[PDB]
Structure formats: structure tokens, C-alpha cells
Amino acid sequence: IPLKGLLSIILRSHRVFIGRELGHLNLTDAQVACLLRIHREPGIKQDELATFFHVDKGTIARTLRRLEESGFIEREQDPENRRRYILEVTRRGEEIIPLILKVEERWEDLLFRDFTEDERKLFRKMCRRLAEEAVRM
Amino acid sequence: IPLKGLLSIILRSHRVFIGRELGHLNLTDAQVACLLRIHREPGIKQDELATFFHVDKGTIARTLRRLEESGFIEREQDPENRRRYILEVTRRGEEIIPLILKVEERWEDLLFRDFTEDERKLFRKMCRRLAEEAVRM
């Protein structure tokens, strides 16, 4: 199994966990990712968010529509370009972030149950280093 | 940044790399994942592949349509259920797998450039352990 395959197995568990724990909010992994990204960059253009994730436009469009329907984000026309849209997290969206982060913590604790704390720390440090390389790549 | 966020940054580099290196084949990360999964399980039902990835039906449908249009997979009606479809990789699809695996190897080598071999081995071992937990979860 290629490294990416292992990472994908891990991420699939995250997807299932998010869907189960936050399903009452009609949230999915894809929506949470978009919500957190907009949260850290208020006013980001939809096309900029699409470029950031490097996924197909159709997928991002449907994901954002669901977040908007649920009232977690707002979308407005870019005053400088009628072909662009500005995204921002609503008050409702900002208020569910703690819940999201708590679910992330719970998922991590479950995933690392058979890891000593030193191993978990080393894994995290290595991931940070690989993420740094990934950004450069 | 939550662990999943770090893993996602890493996976985003993989997505961009796959798109660039295999773009001449109109392949994307999502299509490669589906192709490899069907490759290892000939005859898998489309709904079973959808369940395996735990992603929305619409996304999987579009991903599989692209693979079919490119002639890498074939889809046929399940003789036991008119609501199900059987997937299989075509000869053309099986022949591009080596190219895909070579690209995976190149991506990994680039990602691990600043890692000693012992660190890369330890990272892989930890990922396998986490993937095993992910399956149990």
C-alpha cells in the first residue's frame, strides 16, 4: 500500500467519525474543512477556497451550498468582480467550532489509544515536517 | 492544527502532484483512488465502492463517469439487482497502474527528502498502526 493509501484509510475513519458525531448538524468532513478554512480567513473568495483545496468546482459548490443552507456561512457577490463570491462564517457557524474541535480531539484520542505519548508526539512532529515539505512542493 | 489538518495538507500535495503528473491521462486523485480500489476488487458494486469511501453518491458517480469516459473502467448492470452496477478495470486501465505507482513513488521520495531512512521507516510503521486502528474504529 502506497503511503497515500495508508493516510487515506486514516482519513476515512475521520470522515465516518465526523459524520456520526456531527450528523445532527448535517455536517460532513468536507463541510467542516471548508468551514474551518473560511473561519481562519474571513472574506476568502469562493474561487480562492476552491483553488486552495484543489478539488473540482462542482464538489466545492455543493459543499458550500450545504453549509449555507444550514446557516453556517454566508456568501455575497464580490463588489470588484461579478464572477466572484465572498465567504464568511456566520455567528452560528463560529459557535459550533468548539464542538468541531472537541470531536477532532476525541477522534485523535481514539486513533492513538495504542500509542505511547512519546510516539504520538513523534508522529505529530513528523507530520508537521511532511506538511511543511508538502507546502513547498 | 488538528492532526487531520496536517494529514490533509500532505494529501493536498498528493492531489496536485497526481493532477500534474497524470493530467495527460485526465486523471485526478479521486479517480486514481477508485481505479486502484476496483483493480484490487474486480466486480465490486458501485454502491459498495461508494460505501467503502464514505463519500457522497454524487461525487463518486461523477468520478466513475470520468474513468469510464476515459476507458479505464467498465460498468455493467448487476444481474441480481437492477439498482446495482458492477465495476471492473479495463485492459487499458490495468496497463496504466504501473505509471500510477511510479508517480506515487516519486511523490513519496519528494515528500521524504529531508527524512533519514530510519525516520521514513518509523513514519510508515506508525501509519500502518494508525490505519489498523482506523479500520477497527
Side-chain angles (χ1 to χ4, degrees):
Chain A
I1 302 175
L3 176 68
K4 183 268 180 177
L6 292 176
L7 298 185
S8 287
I9 290 169
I10 295 169
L11 290 167
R12 279 198 287 282
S13 75
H14 177 274
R15 183 148 47 192
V16 172
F17 196 76
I18 286 295
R20 304 295 287 187
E21 300 280 48
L22 300 172
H24 59 292
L25 298 176
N26 287 329
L27 285 170
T28 55
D29 188 308
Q31 291 179 74
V32 167
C34 284
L35 188 62
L36 295 179
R37 188 72 183 70
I38 299 167
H39 169 61
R40 66 176 304 296
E41 188 166 341
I44 187 173
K45 274 66 174 176
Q46 178 171 327
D47 61 90
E48 299 179 314
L49 187 68
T51 299
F52 172 81
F53 287 118
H54 300 284
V55 292
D56 63 86
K57 292 167 52 56
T59 299
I60 170 174
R62 296 195 70 87
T63 300
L64 294 173
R65 189 174 300 184
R66 294 178 65 178
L67 281 170
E68 189 183 306
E69 181 69 303
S70 297
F72 299 135
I73 67 172
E74 60 175 300
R75 176 195 182 192
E76 297 189 62
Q77 177 180 52
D78 178 2
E80 308 188 74
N81 193 315
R82 64 90 173 182
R83 302 160 194 167
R84 308 184 77 188
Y85 292 88
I86 308 304
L87 309 172
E88 185 179 302
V89 182
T90 61
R91 177 66 69 277
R92 182 70 164 66
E94 306 184 302
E95 299 168 318
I96 62 172
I97 301 301
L99 293 168
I100 290 176
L101 293 180
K102 181 186 178 304
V103 170
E104 286 299 337
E105 183 181 304
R106 290 177 56 187
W107 175 72
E108 285 183 47
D109 293 336
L110 286 165
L111 197 77
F112 285 119
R113 275 175 291 183
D114 293 347
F115 267 53
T116 64
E117 198 58 55
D118 289 311
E119 291 180 311
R120 174 196 173 190
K121 186 177 180 178
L122 180 60
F123 189 73
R124 180 75 106 60
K125 292 187 67 66
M126 289 190 284
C127 210
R128 182 185 294 187
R129 288 166 60 196
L130 295 168
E132 299 174 317
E133 181 72 63
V135 170
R136 290 192 293 283
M137 288 173 67
Chain B
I1 302 175
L3 176 68
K4 183 268 180 177
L6 292 176
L7 298 185
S8 287
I9 290 169
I10 295 169
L11 290 167
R12 279 198 287 282
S13 75
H14 177 274
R15 183 148 47 192
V16 172
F17 196 76
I18 286 295
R20 304 295 287 187
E21 300 280 48
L22 300 172
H24 59 292
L25 298 176
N26 287 329
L27 285 170
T28 55
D29 188 308
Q31 291 179 74
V32 167
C34 284
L35 188 62
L36 295 179
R37 188 72 183 70
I38 299 167
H39 169 61
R40 66 176 304 296
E41 188 166 341
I44 187 173
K45 274 66 174 176
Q46 178 171 327
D47 61 90
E48 299 179 314
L49 187 68
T51 299
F52 172 81
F53 287 118
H54 300 284
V55 292
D56 63 86
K57 292 167 52 56
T59 299
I60 170 174
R62 296 195 70 87
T63 300
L64 294 173
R65 189 174 300 184
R66 294 178 65 178
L67 281 170
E68 189 183 306
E69 181 69 303
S70 297
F72 299 135
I73 67 172
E74 60 175 300
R75 176 195 182 192
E76 297 189 62
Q77 177 180 52
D78 178 2
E80 308 188 74
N81 193 315
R82 64 90 173 182
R83 302 160 194 167
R84 308 184 77 188
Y85 292 88
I86 308 304
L87 309 172
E88 185 179 302
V89 182
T90 61
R91 177 66 69 277
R92 182 70 164 66
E94 306 184 302
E95 299 168 318
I96 62 172
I97 301 301
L99 293 168
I100 290 176
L101 293 180
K102 181 186 178 304
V103 170
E104 286 299 337
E105 183 181 304
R106 290 177 56 187
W107 175 72
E108 285 183 47
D109 293 336
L110 286 165
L111 197 77
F112 285 119
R113 275 175 291 183
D114 293 347
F115 267 53
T116 64
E117 198 58 55
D118 289 311
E119 291 180 311
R120 174 196 173 190
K121 186 177 180 178
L122 180 60
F123 189 73
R124 180 75 106 60
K125 292 187 67 66
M126 289 190 284
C127 210
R128 182 185 294 187
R129 288 166 60 196
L130 295 168
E132 299 174 317
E133 181 72 63
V135 170
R136 290 192 293 283
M137 288 173 67

